[PDB]
Structures are given as C-alpha cells and as structure tokens.
Design an enzyme around this catalytic site. Structure first.
Site, PDB file in Angstrom:
ATOM      1  N   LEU A 181       0.828  -1.193   0.000  1.00 30.74           N
ATOM      2  CA  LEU A 181       0.000   0.000   0.000  1.00 30.74           C
ATOM      3  C   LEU A 181       0.867   1.249   0.000  1.00 30.74           C
ATOM      4  CD1 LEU A 181      -2.777  -0.996   2.551  1.00 30.74           C
ATOM      5  CD2 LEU A 181      -2.912  -0.984   0.067  1.00 30.74           C
ATOM      6  N   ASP A 182       0.311   2.324  -0.550  1.00 29.04           N
ATOM      7  CA  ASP A 182       0.898   3.644  -0.423  1.00 29.04           C
ATOM      8  C   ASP A 182       0.691   4.141   1.010  1.00 29.04           C
ATOM      9  OD1 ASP A 182       2.109   5.841  -2.307  1.00 29.04           O
ATOM     10  OD2 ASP A 182       0.614   6.933  -1.134  1.00 29.04           O
TER      11      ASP A 182
END
Ligand SMILES: CCCCCCCCCCCCCCCCCC(=O)OC[C@H](COP(=O)([O-])OCC(O)COP(=O)([O-])OC[C@@H](COC(=O)CCCCCCCCCCCCCCCCC)OC(=O)CCCCCCCCCCCCCCCCC)OC(=O)CCCCCCCCCCCCCCCCC
Ligand SMILES: CCCCCCCCCCCCCCCCCC(=O)OC[C@H](COP(=O)([O-])OCC[N+](C)(C)C)OC(=O)CCCCCCCCCCCCCCCCC
Ligand SMILES: CCCCCCCCCCCCCC(=O)SCCNC(=O)CCNC(=O)[C@@H](O)C(C)(C)COP(=O)(O)O
Ligand code: SF4
Ligand code: SF4
Lengths: 113, 82, 380, 31, 176, 96, 208, 114
Positions: B38-39
């Site tokens: 994930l960012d």
C-alpha cells in the site's frame, strides 16, 4: 486655555501636556539607559529627547511649546513620545547596533544587471 | 468498545470494506506497506476509516505507528478501557 | 452562529459575516477586473504604456496620465515646458471635477438619491466635450505625455472652459441643496465609517480618506508638482472622520477646483507644449517632413521609443481618489522593466473591513461610496 | 504667433463659494 | 491654506433652538429639496433628439480608421510599419512587397478594431498621413469578424470618408 | 432661454436662485465651431546658433545613484527634511 | 541647461544623504546599502531579517515618523539568486519626506510580514504572494487576491508568459466555463527594439 | 546550504503536514461533491485528490513541500468557503480537452511537437 479639540479624529485633548511629556521623556531616557553607550540609537535618541525635555521644562505656555517643539499639536507630540518609548523597548530586544548579520550576494544591489 | 474480540472483528470489517486490500491476504498481523503493498496515503485513509467507525480522532504522531491491524486494535484498546 | 452572505458580482464580490443587522466581518473579493496591466506595460514602450494609465482610474484619466508622465520625466531628467504644466494643472482640476461628480453622485445614487446624478452628468458631458476637443477622445485622451502634452489647445477652448466654470458653482450649489442639509442624507452619512487619524495613516489611506479625519495633508501643497505651487487654493479638512465630512470635503474640493481652473485660465502662458528635446518628444509634423534629424527622431521615437536612463522612482500625485503612485523601474532600455501602480482605492478597500465594523448592511454601500473605489485601479 | 490665450484683461470673476441663499420664515413665525 | 468643513457650533439661544425645532417638525429642508426638483421640472431638458440630432464633436475626433490617398488616387501608405510599431494594442498587421511598378506598398494592412484602443498613435506616427482615425463612430456590427478590417475595408473607408477626413485634417494639422 | 417669464419666475422661486443668469444649457455665447488657423510658437531650442545638444542633453546628465553607505563624534541627529510648516487657516473662507 | 533639463535639488539630496547616514549608523545590523538617486530619492537596502526592526524604526523614531506605507512592491530580477526585490515606499508626513526600503528573497525563503508595523501591508504583500510567489510568514490571511481561484503560477514573474498557459471559454456540452491550453489566433509579435548603440555612458558597466 | 525554513525543520514534519492536508481534502471531497452539485462521484474526486498529491511525490526539499502544503490549504480554503464556483472545481477534470497523443507515432501524425 483648555483646547476644545485636537482636530484629529481619535486623538483626545490632553489636560496636562507638560507633566505628561516630562514623564514620557524621563521614561524614554530610563529605558534608553539600558542600551550600550556606543550605540548610535542611544546617542541620537538621548540627544533629541534631552532637547525636547529642555524645551518642555523651559516653556510654561502650551501654544508656544507647540510652535517650538515643531511637531504639530501637543497631543501628537505626546503620541510620538509614546511611539519612541515603544520603539526603544523594542530596540533593546532587537539589538540592532550589532554588526551586519550577513553580506548580500555580490550583484544583489547592482542595477542595471 | 466493550470487548477486544469485537474491536478486532470490527477493524477487520473496516479493512475488508476497503477495496484495495486483498481479503485473502488480510490477516491480523499483516503489514500494510511491505506485505499488503500500500501507499502511505492508503494507510492514511485506512486510519480515517477507523476514525469513521470508532468515532474518535487519531492524531498524526500515533497513526504513523499503526502498520498492521494488530497495532490498530491495540491502539483502540489503549485509548479505551477493555 | 451568524449569517454568511455572499454578495456576488464597478463589480465587487463581498463576503459578509452578519449578526442580524450588524456587520461582523466584511471580506471584499477582488480581481474581477484584474487584467494584468502592469505585466503588459513591461512588453511595451513608455509611450505605448501611457494609455494603460487612462484605463486604471477611468474617471480620472488625465490625472493618471500626469502621474505616469511625471515619473517618466523624472527618470528622463527633463522637464515639461511651462504652458504644458499649466495645461496639465487645468485639465487635472477638470479631471478632479469629473471624478468628484462621479464620486458624489454615484454615492448618492447607491443610497437612493438618484436625481443629482442626472443633474451633474450633463456638466460631466460638457467636460468630456473639453477632453474631446483637446485630444479627440471623450475619456481616454492619451493627452498628457512624458515631455508635456501631445497637442496644443485649440482656439476657443479656454473661452468655453470659462463659460463652463462660470456656471458650475451653481450646479454644486443645487447638489448641495439636495444633499447637505437633507436629514435623510445626514442619517446615512454622519455616524457612518468613522476613521481615526492614526488608523488612516496606518492603513495607508490617502486623500480625502485622510482629510476627513482631520489630517492636514495634500500632495498639491506638501510635495507640489507641475505648477501647483503657483495656484492658490484651500484644502478642505474634516472633523469627524465620517462619510458626511468626506462628502463635504469632496464638494469643497469641487469648489477649490473651480478656483484653480479660474487661476489657470487667467495665468496660461504662451509657448510650446512639448519639451523641445526631440530625442524625447516627437517633432512637429511640418519639420518631420522637412528636416532629416526630425524625420529620424520621429521614426525612432515612434518605433523604438526614447531610452530612459536606468533607475527606479516612486512618483506620486494627489489624484482625486488620493495618492496615485507609480513605482517605475527602467533598465536603460526604451521599455519599462517594472511599473508598480499604487492606487488609493486598493488601501481604501483594504480598510473597508475596519470601517464597516459595528454598522448595518445598508451602511456598507455608503462606506463603499465614501471610499471612492474604481476597480480598474484597484485590480490593475 | 496665434495661440489659445486668455483675453487682454483676463477673464471675469468666477464664483466658487457656497451660496445657499437662506430663504424662509423664522422659527417663531412658522409656528 | 486649509478650511474646516463642518466645524460650526450651533447657537443655543431660544431663537436658533426654535429655528432648528421648526426645521425638524415642519420639514423645511425637505421642502427645499422638493423646490429644487420642481425647479428642474420647469427647465428645458438637455435631451438631444438622436438620431436626428447629434452630439457635438471636434475635428480631432478619433473614430473609425481609414487609409487615405494622394490627390492623384495613389494611396499614401508606403508600408513603413511605424503605425504597427507604435500600436499599443498590436492591432495593426502589415505585410508588404514591391508591386508591379516597383513602389513600396502594402499587401496586408489589417486593423483588428476589437483590439484597437482608438488612441490615434498610428495617425500621429504615420509620416505621410496614410492611416487616419476618421470621424465615424456609428459602425457597430452584428458579428465579431466584421470588425476585423483588412486593407480593402480601410481603403473603402478612406474613399468613403475622405471629403470629411481631409477637411478635419485641414482644420487641425497646424496643431500637429 | 425660451421659457416664459411666468415659468421663469416660478422656476427661480422654486430653486431660490437666479437661474437665467447661469444657464446650464449652452447658447450663442460659446466658441465658434470653425476657428481661424493657429500659428503655434516654437520652443527655446529652435535656434540656429549656440544650440549644441550636449549643452541641453537632459538624459545624459542623469547619474547613477550616489552610494552613501555600502557594505562593500557628537554629531547632530538629523531628520530627512526640516519639519513641515504648520498650515495656516484660510483667510478666504475658513468656515469659522 | 535651463529650459528642457529637470532642475537638480541639491538641498534635498544633501538632507536625504545625511538621513541615510543616520539610518545606516543607527541600524548597522541590517542596513546593507544606502543610496540617493540623482532625482533625490533615498533607498535603504537592508537584509531581510530586518524587515520588522527597520520599518518599525522609520515608523516610530522621532526623527523619521514614516507613518504612511505608500506602496509595497516586488520586482522579479531572474539573474539574481535572490530574484525578488521587495520594495517598501514610506511617507513621513511630519518631515514631508519619502524613503524606499529594499530587501530581497528567492522563491523559498519567507519574508516576515509587516502587518504588525503597517496594516496597509495586509493586501500588498498578499498581492506579492499572488503575483510573485513570495511567501510572507505570520501574515493574518495570506491567499490570492487578484488571480482567478484555481490559477496556477505567479504571473508577474518574468518567466511567466504574457498570455498565460490556460484560457477560458464557455463550453455548452458541460454547460460550464472551461479552461483549456491557450491558443492565440494571432501570436503576440515580439519586437526587438533595443538599439545596439550605447545610450548612457554614465551607466556603463565595467567589462570582463 | 543553510537556508531558512518555512514551517518544517526537515522532511518528517513536512510529511506530517502533507498527511494532514490529505486528511482534510479526503474529508472535504463528499461535501464538495454535494454543495457544488458535481456530476462526479466521491470516489472520483478522492482519486483526483490522490492524483494531485502523487503528482508532487518526487519532491525532497522541505521548503518546497511546505509551499505545496500552503498552496493546497489555500485551494482547500477556496473550496470549503464557496469562493470557487463549480467551474473552478471542475477544472481539475480536463473534460473538454481532447486526449493528447501519447506515443511517438500519433504525435508524428498530428504535428511537430515532441
Ligand atoms: C397647467 C396646465 C397646462 C397649461 C399649459 C402650459 O403650461 O403651457 C406651457 C406654457 C409655456 O411654458 P414654458 O415652459 O415657459 O414654455 C417654454 C417653451 O420652450 C415655449 O414653447 P415652444 O416655443 O416650444 O412652443 C411650441 C409648443 C407650444 O407649447 C404648447 O402649446 C404648450 C401646450 C399647451 C396646451 O408646442 C409644442 O411643442 C407642441 C405641444 C403638443 C402637445 C401639448 C400637450 C398638452 C397637454 C394636454 C393634452 O406655460 C405657461 O405659459 C405658464 C403656465 C400657464 C398656466 C395657465 C393656467 C392653467
Ligand atoms: C394632504 C397633504 C399631506 C402631506 C403634507 C406634506 C407633503 C410634503 C412632504 C415632503 C417631505 C417628505 C419626506 C419623506 C420622509 C420624511 C422624513 C421626516 O420628515 O421624518 C419626520 C421627522 C423626524 O425628525 P428627525 O428624527 O429627522 O429629527 C431629529 C429629531 N430628534 C433630535 C428629536 C431625534 O419629523 C417628525 O417626526 C415630525 C412629525 C410631524 C410633526 C408635525 C408638526 C406638529 C406640530 C405641533 C405643534 C407644535 C408647536 C410647538 C410645541 C407646543 C405645543 C402646544
Ligand atoms: C476535487 C479536486 C481537488 C484537488 C485537490 C488538490 C490538492 C493538491 C495538494 C498538493 C499537496 C502536495 O502534493 S504536497 C506532497 C509533496 N510531498 C513530497 O514531495 C514528499 C513525498 N511525499 C509522499 O510520498 C507522500 O505520499 C507521504 C504520504 C507524505 C509519504 O508517502 P511515502 O512514504 O509513500
Ligand atoms: S488607434 Fe491606437 S490601438 Fe488603434 S490601430 Fe491606431 S495605434 Fe493601434
Ligand atoms: S505609418 Fe502610415 S505609411 Fe507607415 S505603414 Fe502605417 S499607414 Fe503605412
């Protein structure tokens, strides 16, 4: 003679201008004694404040004091004394008699380029 | 807010409503950045979904340290009694 | 909570925070006439930059022409001829009549007094005939130029300016009959928009916005330009800092402008109207078509333009809205490097938020009237 | 030379002051 | 050198107090304002009867552009591009070449009348009085591109208005 | 100007002023629309001798700004100018 | 040199030079240059850390009393590493005088806001934010004042083009005013106007 | 190399301010879609917010990202207060602009631009 108005809006008439100017000028000198003697702000402001204080102590009349202080109404002379006191209290904190904090870049004030 | 198991199940329900996380890989100790991929802003909107569900504002200094659902349920347990 | 009214789109956006009838916050959103004038000036010559100044305070055209011309003439180290200076003061006070008619009559129109608008715009139409006779345009004359003025007065113009000026004080008298002693006009202006002298100095106010508060300051007296030290006039000074004393100051400035115009008509000297440096002002067309130097100078002044020596000035005039300034920076070329335009209405409309506190919503249109705001100069 | 000039004696006097001519009866008379 | 607007202290004898009370209760200044409005009711209005009557203009008036000719039919414009150099709006677009008799003449003389600021710098920059800003102001159009004048339109404006343009120049050229 | 004396008297009474002496509509008193031709004078530089441009070159007498201080006793404190003279009240019409 | 030349005012030149010495020696911590132009205008070129101490001095000192902020200005000079030149124009009504206070910043260094000295500055430096991109620290409400609401870039920078990057039109499909990349039917015609001959020998820069 | 900061002493405080600005935009997007009565979804507006944040994701200077946070707060203040109209909000969605040619060959076909 109890001047009715100063002519300037928001600038009220001072009842006792001589005593108020004496208090403000001695307070300017008291604040200004906390500055080093070699500072030009202290020398110049002691000079002009002692000149104005001698003029205030020499003249009982209010109108003639206004003509020889040469600063308009006596109430804006009081306002300028208050501004000078506030300035001197700020100049103690700023300490601007110190050397230059940084030289500019070599062509910063060269015009034209 | 009553029991820790209900808080853990509700954290996992919020995370399975979140569409970018694969529900097959979603576990309690799964890391968001290096495991789920994930960012950081994905983790930020995860924390805002947790604020939507649990009803209290999470500051920034203690939301950056929430990198797995176990840290989230432990933080919600620490900000409550349980 | 308190009400938020977005008075949408001169043209102005206002964001009011009201608390019933009272105004708690006034946020003027501007830029609705931002046209990037002073970026456009950087790509044009000094002569080409001149007609942008007509269009800033577009009820005070030749005054802004005069301010820009004085800035360029200061940087050029040249002076206009005396007749040009007297023409500039004559048309500057005609311009001051134009602007104060616009100011007073639209300020009365926005409050509800619609009739002296129509009465005074016929006089304003006659002064636009004066502009058209001297330049060819009713409003944007492009007439006052660096070096002097563009063209000499036509024959018979000064007689017609005399015939206007002889009758204009009766027009001021009937305007003043409609408004000054009227109790409805006094109820809309007397306790409205009171500015102290110290706040007016601190907020960058100028002109009537200072002089309504009792500040004895007028740039035609204190820092005089072209021949204003040779004309005799009075400076109207207010006493309460309100809308009503600023109204009376503008009416009395129309009186004193008529006085100055009479003195300019009687003391107009003979002579040339451009500076006789043909490297600055273009030569006459008869000598342009005869002399080689005059044709070369005509060619170069209308294509390259004159080079201005490098340096920066801040040149200000007493425009009818207040101190109108140009901070002009020349790099040595024939185009301005930078031209910051100081308008009075910018600082006045910035002070609108302090001036409107504690007043009603109907008082805000009166305060926007007493600050003579033209958004061309506000937004550039 | 021929130029737009004022006449030889100059122009006439131009009024510029307030003239509100003070008309009407007294306040005693109007009641 | 200065005067005080509104620094009058009102008189407080019973005469002046009764005068102000009569002005308050009997509405005297309001009747004064009604008298002034009634006075303009019986004046002749300043209204001219347009289009049959026209607003007065001077021979300096800056209106619709025109390209002029010599008194032989030869056009005055010798393509020097001073008018487009001085044009503050860049409203003028000029292309030129030698024509068939070797004369320096324009092939393109465009004035965008919707860029044009009508300031007349082109007619004062013109060394041969070719471009003029004539006397016509009644040339409103129904379409934007009808105000994008080419050389044919400007020469037809010259041929249309020359009898007036030459007499206006005759009245004003000694001031130029 | 074409008003009858009854309307003229009513109008002067209602305004309270003599309106015919100062009419706001213009008549034959204004200048003629056709004028004689001008003969405009020339300036001081229209001379055939003693008229060298270097003796009247304004732009070339402009100097760069004199550097008063640069970073590469009991002297009097100064102001940027003398203090401004107090304005005198108008002898013409002070409203006093 | 009488009729066409502007007369020189040596009295005001001497007075402004003396007052520039006065300011430079009262405030040596910040004053970098003091210069007086040939048309007698005083410029105090200062370090940007002394925006507040210099301007409060000139506002409040009894020999200065520069109570009015006439104008506040930035100038973009891209060949300087501190490309923005912040210009304060001050008016003393007491001594009937004007002074110019000049400082500098680049794109990233904030200048201290002078709203605590002159409230007049509130919009002006706000304009300097909108037109040049100079951030003013401790400003009350710093935002755009003149450009459109979604405007990208700072227009009075000299690398910003004359026409912008976008232009507006009404689009009837979306029933909305839309922004598109700018296409001009006629390009602005760049004129190279500078003569290749030197105009002013007094302003000649020394060669390499 | 010793410069004066704007708000952040380093990049961690800067990322904190970026993160709070992203939180505020994420909260504001549904209200913006509602009161401007936009024709986009909340997911589409939040994707546009994520696109505008990821466009500036390469910056390593704390002063530059401080100015980016300041300008994002200004845009957010213009959005929360109804100072923008619907047109200014929809300028982020270049809807009337035709898609530019991306590859070499279509740019070769349409014109001269690289
Ligand atoms: C009160 C009721 C009205 C009384 C008539 C009236 O006031 O006549 C104006 C007449 C002239 O007034 P003025 O303003 O001095 O005239 C200036 C004109 O420029 C001088 O007039 P002029 O030189 O312009 O003369 C030409 C003019 C001549 O003017 C008239 O004929 C006026 C209309 C008379 C009816 O004719 C026209 O313009 C044609 C007018 C056609 C329409 C008339 C409509 C009348 C209303 C009823 C229907 O007024 C008087 O003589 C004073 C009032 C008399 C009252 C009498 C008792 C009642
Ligand atoms: C059939 C015809 C009917 C209409 C007749 C009039 C037509 C023409 C009208 C023209 C003007 C119209 C203007 C519209 C707006 C009006 C505004 C206005 O005037 O507001 C009211 C104004 C308001 O005044 P104000 O508030 O502006 O003044 C300030 C007042 N102080 C200082 C107290 C706050 O006046 C009145 O309220 C007066 C009301 C009418 C009084 C009538 C007279 C009574 C006299 C009695 C005898 C007294 C004798 C002395 C005492 C001894 C007694 C024994
Ligand atoms: C409806 C439309 C509304 C549009 C809204 C427009 C808002 C635009 C605001 C722009 C603000 C920014 O871009 S500041 C971001 C700059 N940050 C940086 O350069 C530092 C790098 N930052 C990042 O990578 C960020 O993702 C994080 C979250 C701070 C860290 O992530 P990394 O770790 O993985
Ligand atoms: S009048 Fe002015 S703007 Fe119009 S074409 Fe002539 S020079 Fe250009
Ligand atoms: S200035 Fe006159 S001659 Fe020269 S190109 Fe223009 S119209 Fe033709």
């Amino acid at each position: 003679l109890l001047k009715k108005t100063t002519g300037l809006v928001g600038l009220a008439v001072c009842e006792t201008p001589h005593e108020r100017l004496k208090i403000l000028y001695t307070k300017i000198l008291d604040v200004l004694g906390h500055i080093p003697k070699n500072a030009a702000y202290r020398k110049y402001t002691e000079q002009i404040t002692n000149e104005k204080l001698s003029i205030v102590k020499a003249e009982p009349d209010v109108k003639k004091l206004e003509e020889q202080l040469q600063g308009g109404q006596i109430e804006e002379v009081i306002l300028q004394a208050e501004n000078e006191l506030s300035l001197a209290r700020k100049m103690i904190q700023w300490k601007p008699w110190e050397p230059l904090v940084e030289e500019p870049p070599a062509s910063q004030w060269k015009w034209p380029i | 807010p009553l029991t820790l198991e209900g808080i853990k199940d509700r954290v996992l329900y919020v995370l399975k409503l979140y569409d970018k996380i694969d529900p097959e890989k979603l576990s309690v100790n799964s890391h968001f950045m290096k495991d789920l991929g994930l960012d950081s802003l994905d983790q930020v909107e995860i924390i805002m979904a947790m604020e939507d569900e649990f009803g209290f504002e999470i500051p920034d200094i203690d939301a950056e340290k929430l990198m797995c659902p176990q840290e989230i349920v432990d933080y919600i347990a620490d900000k409550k009694d349980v | 909570s308190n009400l938020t009214l977005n008075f949408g789109p001169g043209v102005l956006r206002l964001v009011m925070e009201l608390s019933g009838e009272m105004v708690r916050k006034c946020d003027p959103h501007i830029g609705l006439l931002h046209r990037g004038t002073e970026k456009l000036i950087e790509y044009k010559t000094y002569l080409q930059a001149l007609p942008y100044f007509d269009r800033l305070d577009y009820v005070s055209m030749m005054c802004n022409e005069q301010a820009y011309s004085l800035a360029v003439e200061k940087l050029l180290n040249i002076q206009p001829p005396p007749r040009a200076q007297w023409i500039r003061v004559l048309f500057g006070e005609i311009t001051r009549l134009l602007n104060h008619i616009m100011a007073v009559t639209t300020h009365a129109l926005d409050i509800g007094a619609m009739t002296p608008f129509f009465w005074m715009f016929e006089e304003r139409e006659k002064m636009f005939e004066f502009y058209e006779r001297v330049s060819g345009a009713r409003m944007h004359a492009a007439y006052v130029r660096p070096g002097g003025v563009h063209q000499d007065l036509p024959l018979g113009l000064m007689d017609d300016i005399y015939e206007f000026s002889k009758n204009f004080s009766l027009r001021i008298d009937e305007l003043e009959e409609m408004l000054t002693n009227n109790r409805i006009w006094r109820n809309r202006t007397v306790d409205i928009g009171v500015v102290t002298a110290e706040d007016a100095l601190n907020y960058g106010f100028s002109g009537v916005m200072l002089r309504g508060s009792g500040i004895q300051w007028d740039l035609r007296k204190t820092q005089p330009y072209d021949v204003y030290d040779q004309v005799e006039f009075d400076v109207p000074i207010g006493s309460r800092g309100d809308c009503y004393d600023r109204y009376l100051c503008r009416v009395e400035e129309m009186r004193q402008s008529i006085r100055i115009i009479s003195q300019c008509l009687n003391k107009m000297p003979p002579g040339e109207i451009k500076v006789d440096d043909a490297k600055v002002s273009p030569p006459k067309r008869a000598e342009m078509k005869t002399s080689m130097e005059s044709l070369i100078h005509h060619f170069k002044l209308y294509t390259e333009g004159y080079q201005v020596p490098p340096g920066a000035t801040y040149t200000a005039i007493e425009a009818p809205k207040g101190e109108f300034g140009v901070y002009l920076v020349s790099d040595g070329s024939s185009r301005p490097y930078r031209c910051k335009i100081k308008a009075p209405g910018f600082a006045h409309l910035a002070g609108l938020d302090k001036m409107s506190k504690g007043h009603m919503l109907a008082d805000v249109v009166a305060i926007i009237g007493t600050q003579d705001i033209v958004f061309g100069e506000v937004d550039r | 030379v021929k130029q737009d000039m004022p006449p030889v004696g100059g122009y006439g006097p131009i009024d510029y002051k307030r003239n509100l001519p003070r008309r009407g009866l007294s306040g005693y008379s109007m009641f | 050198t200065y005067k005080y607007v509104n620094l009058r202290e009102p008189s407080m004898d019973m005469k002046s107090v009764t005068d102000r009370a009569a002005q308050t209760l009997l509405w005297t200044e309001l009747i004064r304002g009604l008298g002034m409005t009634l006075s303009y009711l019986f004046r002749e209005p300043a209204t001219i009867n347009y289009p049959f009557e026209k607003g007065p203009l001077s021979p300096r008036f800056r209106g619709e552009h025109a390209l002029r000719r010599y008194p032989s039919g030869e056009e005055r414009c010798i393509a020097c591009k001073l008018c487009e150099a001085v044009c503050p709006a860049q409203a003028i677009t000029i292309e030129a070449e030698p024509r068939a008799d070797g004369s320096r003449r324009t092939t393109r003389y465009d004035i965008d009348m919707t860029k044009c600021i009508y300031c007349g710098f082109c007619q004062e920059a013109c060394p041969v009085d070719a471009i003029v800003e004539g006397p016509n102001f009644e040339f409103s159009t129904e379409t934007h591109e009808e105000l994008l004048y080419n050389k044919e339109k400007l020469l037809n404006n010259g041929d249309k208005w020359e009898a007036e343009i030459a007499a206006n120049i005759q009245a004003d050229y000694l001031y130029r | 100007a074409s008003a009858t004396r009854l309307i003229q008297g009513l109008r002067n009474w209602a305004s309270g002023r003599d309106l015919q002496a100062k009419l706001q509509l213009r008549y034959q008193e204004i200048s003629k629309r056709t004028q004689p031709p001008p003969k405009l004078p020339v300036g001081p530089s229209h001379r055939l001798s003693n008229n060298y441009y270097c003796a009247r070159d304004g732009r070339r007498e402009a100097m760069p700004p004199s550097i008063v201080m640069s970073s590469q006793s009991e002297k009097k404190a100064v102001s940027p100018a003398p203090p401004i003279k107090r304005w005198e009240l108008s002898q013409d019409e002070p409203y006093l | 040199t009488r009729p066409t030349v502007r007369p020189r005012n040596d009295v005001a030149h001497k007075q402004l030079s003396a007052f520039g010495e006065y300011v430079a020696e009262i405030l040596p911590k910040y004053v970098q240059q003091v210069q007086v132009s040939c048309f007698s205008e005083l410029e105090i070129c200062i370090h940007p850390d002394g925006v507040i101490p210099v301007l409060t001095f000139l506002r409040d000192h009894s020999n200065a009393q520069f109570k009015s902020l006439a104008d506040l200005t930035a100038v973009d000079i891209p060949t300087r590493q501190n490309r923005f030149e912040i210009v304060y124009n001050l008016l003393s009504l007491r001594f009937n005088s004007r002074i110019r206070v000049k400082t500098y910043t680049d794109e990233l260094t904030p200048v201290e806001s002078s709203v605590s000295v002159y409230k007049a500055a509130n919009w002006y430096e706000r304009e300097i934010w909108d037109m040049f991109g100079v951030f003013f620290a401790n400003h009350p409400d710093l935002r755009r004042i003149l450009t459109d609401y979604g405007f990208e870039g700072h227009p009075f920078r000299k690398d910003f083009p004359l026409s912008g990057y976008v232009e507006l039109r009404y689009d009837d499909e979306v029933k909305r005013v839309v922004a598109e990349p700018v296409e001009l039917a006629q390009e602005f015609r760049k004129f190279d106007l500078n003569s290749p001959w030197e105009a002013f020998p007094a302003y000649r820069q020394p060669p390499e | 190399t010793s410069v004066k900061p704007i708000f952040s002493r380093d990049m961690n405080e800067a990322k904190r301010r970026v993160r709070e600005l992203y939180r505020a935009w994420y909260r504001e997007v549904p209200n913006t879609v509602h009161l401007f009565q936009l024709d986009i979804s909340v997911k589409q507006g939040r994707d546009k917010v994520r696109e505008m944040f990821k466009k500036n994701a390469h910056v390593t200077d704390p002063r530059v990202v401080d100015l980016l946070v300041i300008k994002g707060k200004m845009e957010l203040e213009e959005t929360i207060n109804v100072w923008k109209q619907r047109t200014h909000v929809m300028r982020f969605f270049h809807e009337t602009e035709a898609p530019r040619p991306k590859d070499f060959l279509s740019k070769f076909y349409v014109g001269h631009d690289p």
